[PDB]
Design a protein around this ligand. Structure first.
Ligand SMILES: *c1ccc([N+](=O)[O-])cc1C(=O)Nc1ccccc1
Ligand SMILES: *c1ccc([N+](=O)[O-])cc1C(=O)Nc1ccccc1
Ligand SMILES: *c1ccc([N+](=O)[O-])cc1C(=O)Nc1ccccc1
Length: 270
């Protein structure tokens, strides 16, 4: 672990912090409650959802959804967070060594397949066995209430909870996750890459830092690196299955539109 690797790991850790408002330390302190007696507003039934919705009533009417189904309202706002994280993620990639120096069409292809793998990865930071933080930790929507929603919407988030529980068990911190997200973006395995060489050289540099950092920060978890590698595989499958459910929902739910930026991501993906 040379001084250059430490630096590369902290400069990525820094970009991670300065591009993602919500991190695992903020979420773990909100969820713990040892830094405030003002817990987030809990959303467990349809009534509590409408109470919370009273805060963004303007945005609901401007999008033509206030009178739609609760399932449509939730996952119409869920799409905004996705677009935000795709933006935060794009600016985060500008910190990966040699990423900006790649062909523009490559940068899009890497983010096209990686953002949702990174999203579901970071989404674990705000999750526990009972729910997830929403609105920058101001709210907490419960896992049961998400399952109670009618099909197929109840089938959207439950798989992600299943991933997070086993993923949080690894007990990664923001230092580990920033390098994990950087690794997800630099997969030379994506379909439709022009310079498959430049990327691989860029990945092995990021992957190298991830392994060494994980061996130093979590020395007792001897095979923590291999496990995360398996977690990347799992994430690819998770996003693959996700895009399938989003297509099925776009074609069988007239009230559920697909955000333009998100459509392009999902188009001709899997
Ligand atoms: C999205 C869907 C529903 C609600 N709600 O009914 O409370 C809120 C949101 C949302 O994204 N809120 C928010 C506000 C400010 C900053 C981030 C997120
Ligand atoms: C949907 C997708 C992602 C997130 N997130 O990671 O913060 C949150 C949501 C969501 O459903 N937010 C929400 C907040 C308040 C009321 C309803 C829904
Ligand atoms: C994002 C956050 C909140 C709301 N809302 O309270 O209605 C809506 C959105 C949003 O992204 N709506 C949308 C869906 C599809 C295409 C463009 C915009």
């Amino acid at each position: 672990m040379t001084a250059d690797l430490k630096s590369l790991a902290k400069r990525i850790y820094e970009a991670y912090l300065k591009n993602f408002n919500m991190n695992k330390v903020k979420a773990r302190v909100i969820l713990s409650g040892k830094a405030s007696n003002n817990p987030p507003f809990v959303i467990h039934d349809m009534e509590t959802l409408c109470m919370a919705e009273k805060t963004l009533v303007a945005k609901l009417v401007a999008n033509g959804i206030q009178n739609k189904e609760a399932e449509v309202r939730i996952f119409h706002c869920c799409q905004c967070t996705s677009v935000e994280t795709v933006t935060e993620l794009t600016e985060f990639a500008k910190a990966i060594p040699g990423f900006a120096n790649l062909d523009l069409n490559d940068q899009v292809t890497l983010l096209k397949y990686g953002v949702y793998e990174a999203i579901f990865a970071m989404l674990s930071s705000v999750m526990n066995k009972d729910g997830m933080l929403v609105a920058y930790g101001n709210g907490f929507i419960t896992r049961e209430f998400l399952k109670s929603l009618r099909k197929p919407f109840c089938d959207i988030m439950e798989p992600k909870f299943d991933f997070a529980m086993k993923f949080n068990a690894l007990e990664l911190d923001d230092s580990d996750i920033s390098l994990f997200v950087a690794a997800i973006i630099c997969c030379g395995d994506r379909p439709g890459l022009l310079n498959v060489g430049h990327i691989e050289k860029m990945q092995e540099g990021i992957v190298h830092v991830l392994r060494l950092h994980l061996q130093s920060n979590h020395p007792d978890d001897i095979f923590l690196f291999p496990k995360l590698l398996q977690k990347m595989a799992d994430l690819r499958q998770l996003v693959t299955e996700h895009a399938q459910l989003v297509q099925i929902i776009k074609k069988t739910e007239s009230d559920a539109a697909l955000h333009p930026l998100l459509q392009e991501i999902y188009r001709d993906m899997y």
